[PDB]
Design an enzyme around this catalytic site. Sequence first.
Site, short mmCIF file in Angstrom:
data_model
loop_
_atom_site.label_atom_id
_atom_site.label_comp_id
_atom_site.label_asym_id
_atom_site.label_seq_id
_atom_site.Cartn_x
_atom_site.Cartn_y
_atom_site.Cartn_z
N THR A 159 0.82 -1.24 0.01
CA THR A 159 -0.10 -0.10 -0.12
C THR A 159 0.83 1.30 -0.16
O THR A 159 0.76 2.12 -1.00
CB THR A 159 -1.23 -0.07 1.18
OG1 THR A 159 -1.79 -0.98 0.90
CG2 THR A 159 -1.99 1.36 1.31
N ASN A 180 5.88 -1.84 3.83
CA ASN A 180 5.22 -1.21 4.88
C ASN A 180 6.10 -1.44 6.15
O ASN A 180 5.63 -0.94 7.32
CB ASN A 180 3.92 -2.10 5.11
CG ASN A 180 3.01 -1.63 3.98
OD1 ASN A 180 2.79 -0.70 3.37
ND2 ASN A 180 1.98 -2.83 3.63
N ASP A 308 -4.03 1.25 -5.82
CA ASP A 308 -2.76 0.94 -5.44
C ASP A 308 -2.19 -0.51 -5.73
O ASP A 308 -0.99 -0.51 -6.10
CB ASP A 308 -2.54 1.28 -4.15
CG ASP A 308 -3.17 0.59 -3.09
OD1 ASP A 308 -4.01 -0.41 -3.19
OD2 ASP A 308 -3.18 0.55 -1.92
C1 LIG Z 1 1.39 6.18 1.88
C2 LIG Z 1 0.82 7.32 1.34
N1 LIG Z 1 1.79 8.19 0.52
N2 LIG Z 1 1.04 9.24 0.16
N3 LIG Z 1 -0.18 9.18 0.52
C3 LIG Z 1 -1.17 10.11 0.10
C4 LIG Z 1 -2.32 9.77 -0.66
C5 LIG Z 1 -1.78 9.45 -2.02
C6 LIG Z 1 -2.68 9.36 -3.00
C7 LIG Z 1 -2.47 9.52 -4.46
F1 LIG Z 1 -1.06 9.30 -4.76
F2 LIG Z 1 -2.64 10.73 -5.04
F3 LIG Z 1 -2.93 8.46 -5.31
C8 LIG Z 1 -4.12 9.09 -2.88
C9 LIG Z 1 -4.73 9.09 -1.07
C10 LIG Z 1 -3.75 9.36 -0.23
C11 LIG Z 1 -3.99 9.33 1.19
C12 LIG Z 1 -3.85 7.83 1.91
C13 LIG Z 1 -4.34 7.81 3.53
O1 LIG Z 1 -5.38 8.56 3.45
N4 LIG Z 1 -3.75 6.95 4.46
C14 LIG Z 1 -4.34 7.05 5.60
C15 LIG Z 1 -3.41 7.72 6.79
N5 LIG Z 1 -1.80 7.33 6.31
S1 LIG Z 1 -0.84 7.43 7.82
O2 LIG Z 1 0.02 6.47 7.63
O3 LIG Z 1 -1.66 7.68 8.97
C16 LIG Z 1 -0.03 8.58 7.58
C17 LIG Z 1 -0.08 10.26 7.98
C18 LIG Z 1 0.79 11.13 7.63
C19 LIG Z 1 1.87 11.19 6.82
S2 LIG Z 1 2.88 12.39 6.42
N6 LIG Z 1 4.43 12.08 7.11
O4 LIG Z 1 3.30 12.27 4.99
O5 LIG Z 1 2.32 13.29 7.15
C20 LIG Z 1 2.15 9.76 6.36
C21 LIG Z 1 1.40 8.65 6.68
C22 LIG Z 1 -1.39 6.94 5.02
C23 LIG Z 1 -2.61 6.08 4.10
N7 LIG Z 1 -0.35 7.98 1.20
CL LIG Z 2 7.06 -5.02 3.18
ZN LIG Z 3 -3.60 -4.79 2.37
#
Ligand SMILES: Cc1nnn(Cc2cc(C(F)(F)F)ccc2CCC(=O)N2CCN(S(=O)(=O)c3ccc(S(N)(=O)=O)cc3)CC2)n1
Ligand SMILES: [Cl-]
Ligand SMILES: [Zn+2]
EC number: 3.1.4.39
Length: 805
Positions: A159, A180, A308
């Site tokens: 993911t 992950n 994804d």
């Molecule tokens: C992984 C990841 N990488 N990029 N994304 C954003 C992304 C990219 C696309 C696209 F590329 F457009 F398709 C679509 C939807 C999303 C949203 C995904 C999402 O809501 N979640 C649930 C929440 N978390 S978390 O682990 O709590 C977390 C929180 C803060 C940070 S930080 N340090 O960057 O502030 C890092 C992780 C990741 C997965 N998620």
């Molecule tokens: Cl892994």
């Molecule tokens: Zn999974």
Amino acid sequence: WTATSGSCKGRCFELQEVGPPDCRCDNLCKSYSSCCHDFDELCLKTARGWECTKDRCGEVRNEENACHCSEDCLSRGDCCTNYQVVCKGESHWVDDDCEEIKVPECPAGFVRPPLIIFSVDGFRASYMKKGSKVMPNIEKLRSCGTHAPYMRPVYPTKTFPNLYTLATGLYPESHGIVGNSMYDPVFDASFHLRGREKFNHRWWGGQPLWITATKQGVRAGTFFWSVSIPHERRILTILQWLSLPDNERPSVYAFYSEQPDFSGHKYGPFGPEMTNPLREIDKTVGQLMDGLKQLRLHRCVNVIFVGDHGMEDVTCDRTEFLSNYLTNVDDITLVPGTLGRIRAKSINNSKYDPKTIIAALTCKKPDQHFKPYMKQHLPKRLHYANNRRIEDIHLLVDRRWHVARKPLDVYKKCFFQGDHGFDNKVNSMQTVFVGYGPTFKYRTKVPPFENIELYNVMCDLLGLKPAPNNGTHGSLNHLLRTNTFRPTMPDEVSRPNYPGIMYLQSEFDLGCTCDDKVENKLEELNKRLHTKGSTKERHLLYGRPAVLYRTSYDILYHTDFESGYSEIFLMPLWTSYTISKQAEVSSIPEHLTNCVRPDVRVSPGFSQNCLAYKNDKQMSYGFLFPPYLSSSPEAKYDAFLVTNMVPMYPAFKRVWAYFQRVLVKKYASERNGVNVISGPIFDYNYDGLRDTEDEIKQYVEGSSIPVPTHYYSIITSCLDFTQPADKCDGPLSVSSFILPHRPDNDESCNSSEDESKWVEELMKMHTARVRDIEHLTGLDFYRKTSRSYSEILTLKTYLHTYESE
Ligand SMILES: Cc1nnn(Cc2cc(C(F)(F)F)ccc2CCC(=O)N2CCN(S(=O)(=O)c3ccc(S(N)(=O)=O)cc3)CC2)n1
Ligand SMILES: [Cl-]
Ligand SMILES: [Zn+2]
Ligand SMILES: *[C@@H]1O[C@H](CO)[C@@H](O[C@@H]2O[C@H](CO)[C@@H](O[C@@H]3O[C@H](CO[C@H]4O[C@H](CO)[C@@H](O)[C@H](O[C@H]5O[C@H](CO)[C@@H](O)[C@H](O)[C@@H]5O[C@H]5O[C@H](CO)[C@@H](O)[C@H](O)[C@@H]5O)[C@@H]4O)[C@@H](O)[C@H](O[C@H]4O[C@H](CO)[C@@H](O)[C@H](O)[C@@H]4O[C@H]4O[C@H](CO)[C@@H](O)[C@H](O)[C@@H]4O)[C@@H]3O)[C@H](O)[C@H]2NC(C)=O)[C@H](O)[C@H]1NC(C)=O
Ligand SMILES: [Ca+2]
Ligand SMILES: [K+]
């Protein structure tokens, strides 16, 4: 510390996050346990649910309600998504006939069409067909917009690596989210799914789309959503943000669903329990499109529906245990599951040898459901090696299986029936893409493409300049109505020399002999013309490749083939030849078995020699144009020129010989001729990029003949196979490979059998895009065709995967 005594009155889902100790009201606050005391009350209202009903229509505005059915709601921009349907006799978006969107039909003040990315975890490619009766909104998007049959994820098909590749256009090795679970040895820190270290910005390389947008004056809605925020509230927030004033309103937005991945893990990819999660996703899509239509944004906004990765059937009984292969199982650490990463438990233990570990995991059971690898020997198509966070030892696990360290890890930690993370060529890991809106095409099927390419397209959709990334910009121009990026061919850096006959036989002291002392003005003028370039139109069909770095090389012409010979590396960078459907294989005659001949156009000092190969007991030699396919006994002598020679391990020669003797002819029959361009690759630092001279770690003993890490071939023909490769009016068809140049065949467990039972299988595994080969050689192919450059870019990113339908 977070002093949560502040308030979220008027700050609900704020777009600029505030710094501690002030409390937060952004859509991530829950995940850091930092929201203000009243966040639930004010920002996560749920009263009366998610839909207007007849009796709520025209009501008194009650601010407590989750969404509103009052008369003013539209202008406040906080109606329930179905308000106009229930209270004003409008139709749902899904019930409307779809009508081409030739131009953006946007409200005044919108400076560009907004972009909304609807990302869905675990949405396997085949659900588009197999769940079509229960996903009518998604199916309308797909059929009325632009769609591919599937989209290829990156490896590992997990993911976080994939969502962040979508965000950046980078391979995980380059953006840093390589799994992950991760350990960084320079930080001495671990990244996990649970807990707080994942929020540190030092893990997250490259430049994701939202930062690219912000930096260039394009406002971005925050992409992340805390898990507890329900889907219906995420949609309403996105719709609220679209109601905002022109100077505050974002131009790009993201929605994320944890389904269907979450259910898929419990019930397997096609469990009967999976129908319901797909209904709910479709319902959410329906809410968005209904919401957009209320706001007259449904023929204004570009919507991307993208997954994804997919999901495979995986159960606890299908686990391989390293304890059934390794005596020393407690001295290692294993990142487990659908892939394996092995390092030492303690770096103090100097009796940790990765070689003996690899050997203990190699071909030990006849059905072994994983294959170990030094990371630099993994197929180059995976681009999974150039990061300190990726362990030297890797296990590629068969689809449907797991790898664990010991049995206690499997029963002290059967629950799951689905998983993912496997090789990204596997059908079950493939995911989806739909594009819908003014900038996408109407009712258009596009071919499968890789998710690394979307960052560029999303930049194009937003009028942004993309940060340097691993997409090939222009390769997805065929998805778009307009907004296309018009790429140019890279300029050639080094022009070739065209040497004639400049050296006498006797100046060469190579230690190479040939049985060729045999003696005509008909066939002397004729052979000159072959050495000046008469049959070059036949063998170089798409122009000479351009050398895009500074170097010294020669173009060498012959009857059957043409090469660009490097004086620096003492071998060709490329050899181009065409084999028609009706061409004939011959053998290497007995008198020429060990024949190597001086090339009178290239100095002794820029040539290889046979004594080096004699003195090197490990290293033998092979040929780039195969003698087997010489057009005539006279032409066959050209194939034994010292300038057609390349270093080969006897183990690799088995592979090469089979490819050259059998497969090339096989492909020419099946495809109606083929053009082949073959050559060496040097990637000692496994960065996926052409090495300079000073990076080469191995030479043929007692010489400056460098040893390739890999050998490539690009096999091109006509997509309309009724026309022959050499006379093709239309689109091309290509398949290519990057074979590791290895001194053993341990990778192939059945290698002691006949080459016809394993070689072709090895090549399939190391299939490649032309673009992969370009990065590794600094060459640019297909410079002279009758085809558009975008079409050629598409062709260069194509991967022949060898999976079934
Ligand atoms: C992984 C990841 N990488 N990029 N994304 C954003 C992304 C990219 C696309 C696209 F590329 F457009 F398709 C679509 C939807 C999303 C949203 C995904 C999402 O809501 N979640 C649930 C929440 N978390 S978390 O682990 O709590 C977390 C929180 C803060 C940070 S930080 N340090 O960057 O502030 C890092 C992780 C990741 C997965 N998620
Ligand atoms: Cl892994
Ligand atoms: Zn999974
Ligand atoms: C996929 O696309 C990407 C993106 O285009 C391609 O990767 C690029 O490759 C470039 C060429 O290798 C590389 O350019 C180098 O940049 C160095 C400065 O890098 C920093 O700045 C950039 C820009 O903001 C930033 O993005 C970088 O971030 C990386 O590193 C941090 C870790 O500190 C991570 O947080 C981040 O995820 C990212 O990691 C990845 O890249 C690095 C390499 O940059 C890898 O090591 C990681 O494993 C990981 O994959 C950086 O913050 C710059 O210093 C380099 O210059 C040296 O080399 C040149 C050669 O011309 C030489 O002339 C110079 O003197 C200089 O040498 C000096 O340092 C040497 C080593 O210490 C030493 O030997 C010398 O003696 C000198 O002192 C170089 O210009 C670019 O950074 C990356 N970008 C990314 C995002 O990865 C990738 O190639 C594509 N893949 C394929 C297959 O095509
Ligand atoms: Ca390299
Ligand atoms: K030898």
